[PDB]
Design a protein around this ligand. Structure first.
Ligand code: GDP
Ligand code: MG
Ligand code: ZN
Length: 160
């Protein structure tokens, strides 16, 4: 089966690096997606994982972008208060444009940085306000990245 999963949020928060860590298991930094197959309940699920450049940032406001998407991950940077502030607007825009059975997930990235300004309780609180699950991650330190996609994939398959 195919699960189309999108990463959404401000430029610079680590969307691409989260995607590279999940697929490649490494931190480093014209085809729009990567395919990674994962076992859920003993059955192969192929995730179709969408990441677009800030360059291409303009699509996220269109319903075309979310065509067939079943998971959407909203990402902010724990080091950047503004990217966290901006999450309510991302939520709203996603709900305006995506399938209503789409499962969403909040991710606070860069948990490795001692310059953190957004607490885990803050992220937890926002997540309840939006009615969604919440995970803190570090693409750099390899912390909680696989959990992001497995958590979301399991929620999507329970929908199905
Ligand atoms: N310390 C730290 N830096 C990160 C992490 N993830 C990404 N970065 C850096 O933040 C910048 C933005 O990452 P990127 O994946 O391009 O963000 P995008 O605009 O959301 O796709 C790059 O310089 C990354 O090296 C992380 O988990 N920890
Ligand atoms: Mg990117
Ligand atoms: Zn790893």
């Amino acid at each position: 089966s195919i699960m189309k999963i999108l990463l959404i949020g401000d430029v610079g928060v680590g969307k691409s690096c989260l995607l590279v860590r999940f697929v490649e298991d490494k931190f480093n930094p014209g085809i729009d997606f990567k395919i990674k197959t994962v076992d859920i309940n003993g059955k192969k699920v192929k995730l179709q994982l969408w990441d677009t450049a800030g360059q291409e940032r303009f699509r996220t406001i269109t319903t075309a972008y979310y065509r067939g998407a079943m998971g959407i991950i909203l990402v902010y940077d724990v080091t950047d208060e503004r990217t966290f502030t901006n999450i309510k607007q991302w939520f709203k825009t996603v709900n305006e444009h995506a399938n209503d059975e789409a499962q969403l997930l909040l991710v606070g990235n860069k948990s490795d940085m001692e310059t953190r300004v957004v607490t885990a309780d803050q992220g937890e609180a926002l997540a309840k306000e939006l009615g969604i699950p919440f995970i803190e991650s570090s693409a750099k330190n390899d912390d909680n990245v696989n959990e992001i996609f497995f958590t979301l994939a399991k929620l999507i398959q329970e929908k199905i």
